[PDB]
Amino acid sequence: PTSENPKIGPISEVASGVKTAANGIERIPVLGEIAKPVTAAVKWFADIVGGVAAIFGW
Amino acid sequence: PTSENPKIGPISEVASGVKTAANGIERIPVLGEIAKPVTAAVKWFADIVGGVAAIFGW
Amino acid sequence: PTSENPKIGPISEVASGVKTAANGIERIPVLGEIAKPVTAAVKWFADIVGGVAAIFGW
Amino acid sequence: TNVHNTKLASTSAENAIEKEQITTFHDVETPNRIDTPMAQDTSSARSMDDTHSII
Amino acid sequence: KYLRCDVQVKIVLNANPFIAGRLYLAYSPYDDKVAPERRIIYTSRAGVTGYPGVELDFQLDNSVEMTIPYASFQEAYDLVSGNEDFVQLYLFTIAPVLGPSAESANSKVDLSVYMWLDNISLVI
Amino acid sequence: SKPRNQNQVMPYQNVPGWGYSLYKGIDMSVPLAYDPNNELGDLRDVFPSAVDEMAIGYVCGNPAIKHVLTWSTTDVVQNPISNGDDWGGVIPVGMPCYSKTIRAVKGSTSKTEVMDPAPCEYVANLFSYWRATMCYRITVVKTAFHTGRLEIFFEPGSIPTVRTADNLGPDQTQLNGTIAPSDNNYKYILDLTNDTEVTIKVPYVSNKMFMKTVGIYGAHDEDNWNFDESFTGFLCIRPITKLMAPDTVSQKVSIVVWKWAEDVVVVEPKPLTSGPTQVYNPPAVARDLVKQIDVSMQ
Amino acid sequence: SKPRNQNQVMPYQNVPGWGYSLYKGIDMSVPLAYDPNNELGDLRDVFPSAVDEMAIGYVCGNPAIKHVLTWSTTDVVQNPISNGDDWGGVIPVGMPCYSKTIRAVKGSTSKTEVMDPAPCEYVANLFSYWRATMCYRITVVKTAFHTGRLEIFFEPGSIPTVRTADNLGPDQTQLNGTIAPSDNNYKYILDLTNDTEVTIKVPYVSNKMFMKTVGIYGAHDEDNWNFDESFTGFLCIRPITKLMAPDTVSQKVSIVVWKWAEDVVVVEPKPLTSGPTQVYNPPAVARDLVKQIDVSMQ
Amino acid sequence: SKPRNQNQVMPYQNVPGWGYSLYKGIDMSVPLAYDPNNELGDLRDVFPSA
Amino acid sequence: SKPRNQNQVMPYQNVPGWGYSLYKGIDMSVPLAYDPNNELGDLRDVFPSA
Amino acid sequence: INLSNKTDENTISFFDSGDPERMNNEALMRGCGEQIVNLRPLLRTFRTINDNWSLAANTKTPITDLTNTADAEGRDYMSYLSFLYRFYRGGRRYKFFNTTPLKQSQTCYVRSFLIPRNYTADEINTDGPSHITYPVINPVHEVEVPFYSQYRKIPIASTSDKGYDSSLMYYTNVGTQQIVARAGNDDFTFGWMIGTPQLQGITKEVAN
């Protein structure tokens, strides 16, 4: 994208995997718009499954 | 360019594709000076065509 | 992990090497949750074993 | 055609027979149903125990 | 003790070919427990017909079906303690029964509503 | 051990809440929680439906009944069907709301005005300008023995209005086949011999890239400009052939019209209204005065 | 040598102590030390045990005696064993504390209430909502000459309570085999011919994802809702066969019950209690009034 | 979990509107909009002349 | 769309004119100019002697 | 002709027009600069529910006091869009901009705690996570409330249970005035769709 700021936008954009115009009448799933299963996709659950030292207070 | 600042200038420079002295009398197109078609060149339209998760509130 | 911040989390996560659900009744060792032996794992001891110039005031 | 949260009145196949467990409905045309789009099970009963039968 | 179920509704209407009309079967969750301004009662025709429902014409749709999902905010219906209802089903009238001008006992329609459950789970 | 600073003096502005009105950005809202990485999961089995119901196309795609007209055997050809409802025959083509009624309470009179939004008109009211394709299912409630033709033509521009001190409605005298000939007009002649309905979609046509979302809000004899610049035109439902009906059936049929939008874009997140967005809470008794929300900033 | 600034004006908020209540983050606490990289080592030979004893599963996994009931030869079949302790026969299934006694001191009366927490109930009190699998070792103190059967069945939902002005207890009249038939109930019939004990684990079952941690705190005739919504149900210990015992042994046995939790999750680090977490410091004499901690913020 | 700070004390000047009279630079003007990445497109068919 | 902050609380000193007496450093002097990258060229034929 | 009342499902679109997506985009690249495609982004924006909320000194004020009023008005997005749905989930964000005209104490500070919804301040402790600001150096609070619930979805209706989700307490050592803006966290969303209510427009008190 064509910016003049060294930071193109405010946040980091996470992709989706949806395939519909977003303003259209066609019914679109909400699970494709964000994907946040019960996995290491969320930070804290990843920290638990990896048993990081912070979840123990270190 | 020869600077003494670790940041050479204030903004990120985007190239043009124009071929005329900028102070000259020759008529120069305005579409070559910035290129911002209806494409993923603009940030928000890129976000829509990529269906990023932010345009859905995530 | 799926964030919208360029910094995923607040701190740098250090791994553990433990193998038990962290909320479980099974007895888990505390030395695997953080590993900080008397070695160059701690910063100041590393500085001493490496004889860095700061520990001498330079 | 593609409308949400409503099923409009329409024609359908001219000879419909829906069989629930023991009741069997004959209708002149196929009923105009509205079902939930992309339905889910928003309960936890199937996780608590198994559904016991009469036997 | 606990239940999770969807409610399946079927209405079989019958009206001779000389009677016309149109009904709207809609369901409103928490209609009895939600503030009045938020009720399907106490709103407009365009609001009522904005609810999930089925258009029920006498000469087009002699029969309509409807699946009401599990409407509780909690993990299952409590069949002992909480005698709570979570979704109200309404049968509205878009156009009244249109029949001959001449008064007659035959200018009428008869309805019959059937109900059953689906996606069931009795556990504890 | 303790070296000196080689960093520059940083410029700055003490501006808390920079861009709090934007939807995208890093929020400085402190979480009253345990983990700073507090995230709720996805909507896997939370709501009854896995569809995104907050999408503008899902809301503006939910149709609602905005017209229920009575078509009698006496209604004249090439005359709008005015019987039955408040905008009889004339369908203003747009997302905004064109219909309102005045609730009067005496004690002087307050004259509160109430609107009839469809899910497409509820959304448009949150924004200033709109652009969309308007879709109309015009269903007729009849039998196998009612017959007739129905003319549904689109006229661009302003609507012929009878302007009242508190409301605004159509002028049925200026919409007859003599003053309003439908010959140079996009139309659909619907035969009611056996069929009942037709879905008419009107693509966006105007000399403006966007139209206003005001609509009927505050529209009257003095204020009528923003109403005309909120709609691209109107559909008029007129008979081409009188309603033929025997004496064995009703001498009148109902014309139900559902309204919804496709291909929607909304421009700015601020309403064009004199006042804020307010939902009408019907009071208990008709003697009761309605609630007014405090807009005094001090 | 001295170039100009090309950095932007930075936005900002003057907010000291941002996220001090979170467990994870970079703390701005200045160390009164020599090295900024002041780290203590690991717990190699610091404590007597190399096990993490601060883990919720190690604390909530330490069992404690919460019931010591007397089972006499006169106790009736299908009647809860009420003799001996304050919640006789009924075991509220949950992490929170179900038991309390009122300490009264006169001089008017103050009526301070005291609880009997197990290590699982001490932890739950620090949080608002809980979810866990509750485990109960029901041991019987007897000999080779006591015999009898014992019914330990789980009933979900509210407990039959006799509500007092200051406390809350079970209703033994509503838990008999006529009013409370154990036929449609998960149970374990324990034979005491030679065996003594059984560990009964109750997985979490409820119409809520989490239950409240209030328990008996402030529970009485007026306040009884939060108690019922703090437990998934209760186990009731009832005879199936009266205690058979010769005259050469005791005519009563003791039923000891240990309590602990497995598969624990705790939700928010704030208690649901009207007041803060307070440990009871037993005063010297019974005439002495107890300490109350100042909660006035000014 | 909660480590200490190793960052230095930063120097500074409280100067709002630094270089507002320059044509090039990152402006701190808050947009009364929905998207912070609010950009108008190019002048393709806006004015009579390209 | 609007995530939370994961940045730390920054330490600081409100010290305008830090090192103004030094010959080397990034100066916070605002230029009364058009371009922030205002540079004069080299002394090619400015003074009588190179 | 067959005696029949049927639906042929005929659809007509007028005008021989181009692609609506392309033309809409062309228009937004000239007159908007953005394209709103969903209403959760509007739940992320911050909008005012009261531009002056006065408080008493040394008083713990649950913000339900204000949001029970605001939710019925329909002025903010979290209220206007709540009349289309029945359920909601996720946390909430509140910003309190100081507008206190008088000086009461040398040191004014604002503090916020958690509280179960529909509770009173006399029913809850001032423990748990908090956030403190000083309106003189930071006149904006910027606290956030997580979804600390017993249920995966909260109804906008009333309930038998109480205190099943978290909310906010607001404490000021002095009498302060506030601009109260609220929004949802990056996880807040509303439930499943229903019909619209009526809208309230202009009121003209006329002499009779």
PDB file of N, CA and C in Angstrom, chain G residues 103-134:
ATOM      1  N   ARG G 103     -20.106 -16.507  65.861  1.00  0.00           N
ATOM      2  CA  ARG G 103     -19.541 -16.127  67.146  1.00  0.00           C
ATOM      3  C   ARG G 103     -20.264 -14.886  67.650  1.00  0.00           C
ATOM      4  N   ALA G 104     -20.960 -15.024  68.771  1.00  0.00           N
ATOM      5  CA  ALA G 104     -21.724 -13.941  69.368  1.00  0.00           C
ATOM      6  C   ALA G 104     -21.003 -13.432  70.605  1.00  0.00           C
ATOM      7  N   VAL G 105     -20.971 -12.112  70.766  1.00  0.00           N
ATOM      8  CA  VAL G 105     -20.413 -11.485  71.956  1.00  0.00           C
ATOM      9  C   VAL G 105     -21.380 -10.404  72.402  1.00  0.00           C
ATOM     10  N   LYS G 106     -21.770 -10.442  73.667  1.00  0.00           N
ATOM     11  CA  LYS G 106     -22.750  -9.512  74.199  1.00  0.00           C
ATOM     12  C   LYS G 106     -22.098  -8.443  75.060  1.00  0.00           C
ATOM     13  N   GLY G 107     -22.749  -7.286  75.116  1.00  0.00           N
ATOM     14  CA  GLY G 107     -22.247  -6.160  75.878  1.00  0.00           C
ATOM     15  C   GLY G 107     -23.108  -4.920  75.731  1.00  0.00           C
ATOM     16  N   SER G 108     -25.794  -5.051  73.367  1.00  0.00           N
ATOM     17  CA  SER G 108     -26.112  -5.660  72.082  1.00  0.00           C
ATOM     18  C   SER G 108     -25.112  -6.745  71.724  1.00  0.00           C
ATOM     19  N   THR G 109     -25.371  -7.429  70.613  1.00  0.00           N
ATOM     20  CA  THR G 109     -24.563  -8.552  70.166  1.00  0.00           C
ATOM     21  C   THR G 109     -24.047  -8.269  68.762  1.00  0.00           C
ATOM     22  N   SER G 110     -22.840  -8.751  68.473  1.00  0.00           N
ATOM     23  CA  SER G 110     -22.157  -8.443  67.223  1.00  0.00           C
ATOM     24  C   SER G 110     -22.334  -9.516  66.157  1.00  0.00           C
ATOM     25  N   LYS G 111     -22.364 -10.794  66.538  1.00  0.00           N
ATOM     26  CA  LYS G 111     -22.710 -11.880  65.620  1.00  0.00           C
ATOM     27  C   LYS G 111     -21.745 -11.936  64.431  1.00  0.00           C
ATOM     28  N   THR G 112     -20.503 -12.284  64.747  1.00  0.00           N
ATOM     29  CA  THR G 112     -19.486 -12.540  63.738  1.00  0.00           C
ATOM     30  C   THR G 112     -19.563 -13.984  63.265  1.00  0.00           C
ATOM     31  N   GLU G 113     -19.443 -14.178  61.955  1.00  0.00           N
ATOM     32  CA  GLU G 113     -19.557 -15.494  61.340  1.00  0.00           C
ATOM     33  C   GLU G 113     -18.189 -15.989  60.892  1.00  0.00           C
ATOM     34  N   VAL G 114     -17.915 -17.259  61.178  1.00  0.00           N
ATOM     35  CA  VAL G 114     -16.619 -17.880  60.943  1.00  0.00           C
ATOM     36  C   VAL G 114     -16.820 -19.099  60.058  1.00  0.00           C
ATOM     37  N   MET G 115     -15.864 -19.343  59.170  1.00  0.00           N
ATOM     38  CA  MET G 115     -15.950 -20.404  58.180  1.00  0.00           C
ATOM     39  C   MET G 115     -14.865 -21.447  58.422  1.00  0.00           C
ATOM     40  N   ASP G 116     -15.031 -22.594  57.762  1.00  0.00           N
ATOM     41  CA  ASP G 116     -14.182 -23.772  57.931  1.00  0.00           C
ATOM     42  C   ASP G 116     -13.592 -24.184  56.585  1.00  0.00           C
ATOM     43  N   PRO G 117     -12.676 -23.395  56.028  1.00  0.00           N
ATOM     44  CA  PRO G 117     -12.202 -23.683  54.675  1.00  0.00           C
ATOM     45  C   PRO G 117     -11.210 -24.831  54.618  1.00  0.00           C
ATOM     46  N   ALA G 118     -11.349 -25.637  53.583  1.00  0.00           N
ATOM     47  CA  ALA G 118     -10.293 -26.531  53.150  1.00  0.00           C
ATOM     48  C   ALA G 118      -9.405 -25.806  52.155  1.00  0.00           C
ATOM     49  N   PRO G 119      -8.225 -26.346  51.857  1.00  0.00           N
ATOM     50  CA  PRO G 119      -7.320 -25.639  50.943  1.00  0.00           C
ATOM     51  C   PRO G 119      -7.935 -25.333  49.589  1.00  0.00           C
ATOM     52  N   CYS G 120      -8.940 -26.097  49.163  1.00  0.00           N
ATOM     53  CA  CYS G 120      -9.657 -25.789  47.934  1.00  0.00           C
ATOM     54  C   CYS G 120     -10.623 -24.630  48.112  1.00  0.00           C
ATOM     55  N   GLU G 121     -11.189 -24.485  49.308  1.00  0.00           N
ATOM     56  CA  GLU G 121     -12.127 -23.414  49.604  1.00  0.00           C
ATOM     57  C   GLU G 121     -11.426 -22.110  49.945  1.00  0.00           C
ATOM     58  N   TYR G 122     -10.176 -22.183  50.401  1.00  0.00           N
ATOM     59  CA  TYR G 122      -9.383 -20.986  50.643  1.00  0.00           C
ATOM     60  C   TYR G 122      -9.032 -20.292  49.335  1.00  0.00           C
ATOM     61  N   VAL G 123      -8.758 -21.073  48.292  1.00  0.00           N
ATOM     62  CA  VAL G 123      -8.368 -20.520  47.002  1.00  0.00           C
ATOM     63  C   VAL G 123      -9.573 -19.937  46.280  1.00  0.00           C
ATOM     64  N   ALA G 124     -10.675 -20.685  46.244  1.00  0.00           N
ATOM     65  CA  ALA G 124     -11.879 -20.213  45.573  1.00  0.00           C
ATOM     66  C   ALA G 124     -12.340 -18.867  46.108  1.00  0.00           C
ATOM     67  N   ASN G 125     -12.130 -18.606  47.395  1.00  0.00           N
ATOM     68  CA  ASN G 125     -12.589 -17.358  47.987  1.00  0.00           C
ATOM     69  C   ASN G 125     -11.867 -16.146  47.418  1.00  0.00           C
ATOM     70  N   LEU G 126     -10.714 -16.345  46.789  1.00  0.00           N
ATOM     71  CA  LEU G 126      -9.970 -15.256  46.177  1.00  0.00           C
ATOM     72  C   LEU G 126     -10.504 -14.869  44.810  1.00  0.00           C
ATOM     73  N   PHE G 127     -11.451 -15.625  44.275  1.00  0.00           N
ATOM     74  CA  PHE G 127     -11.965 -15.440  42.932  1.00  0.00           C
ATOM     75  C   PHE G 127     -13.480 -15.353  42.988  1.00  0.00           C
ATOM     76  N   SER G 128     -14.076 -14.994  41.855  1.00  0.00           N
ATOM     77  CA  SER G 128     -15.515 -14.795  41.780  1.00  0.00           C
ATOM     78  C   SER G 128     -16.244 -16.056  41.343  1.00  0.00           C
ATOM     79  N   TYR G 129     -15.778 -16.686  40.273  1.00  0.00           N
ATOM     80  CA  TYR G 129     -16.423 -17.855  39.704  1.00  0.00           C
ATOM     81  C   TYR G 129     -15.435 -19.008  39.645  1.00  0.00           C
ATOM     82  N   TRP G 130     -15.960 -20.222  39.771  1.00  0.00           N
ATOM     83  CA  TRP G 130     -15.149 -21.427  39.819  1.00  0.00           C
ATOM     84  C   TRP G 130     -15.743 -22.495  38.916  1.00  0.00           C
ATOM     85  N   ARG G 131     -14.880 -23.417  38.509  1.00  0.00           N
ATOM     86  CA  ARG G 131     -15.281 -24.602  37.770  1.00  0.00           C
ATOM     87  C   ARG G 131     -14.242 -25.675  38.038  1.00  0.00           C
ATOM     88  N   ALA G 132     -14.691 -26.834  38.504  1.00  0.00           N
ATOM     89  CA  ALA G 132     -13.764 -27.861  38.950  1.00  0.00           C
ATOM     90  C   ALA G 132     -14.490 -29.187  39.076  1.00  0.00           C
ATOM     91  N   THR G 133     -13.698 -30.233  39.266  1.00  0.00           N
ATOM     92  CA  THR G 133     -14.186 -31.575  39.540  1.00  0.00           C
ATOM     93  C   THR G 133     -13.923 -31.873  41.005  1.00  0.00           C
ATOM     94  N   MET G 134     -14.985 -32.150  41.745  1.00  0.00           N
ATOM     95  CA  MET G 134     -14.924 -32.266  43.191  1.00  0.00           C
ATOM     96  C   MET G 134     -14.788 -33.726  43.585  1.00  0.00           C
TER      97      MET G 134
END
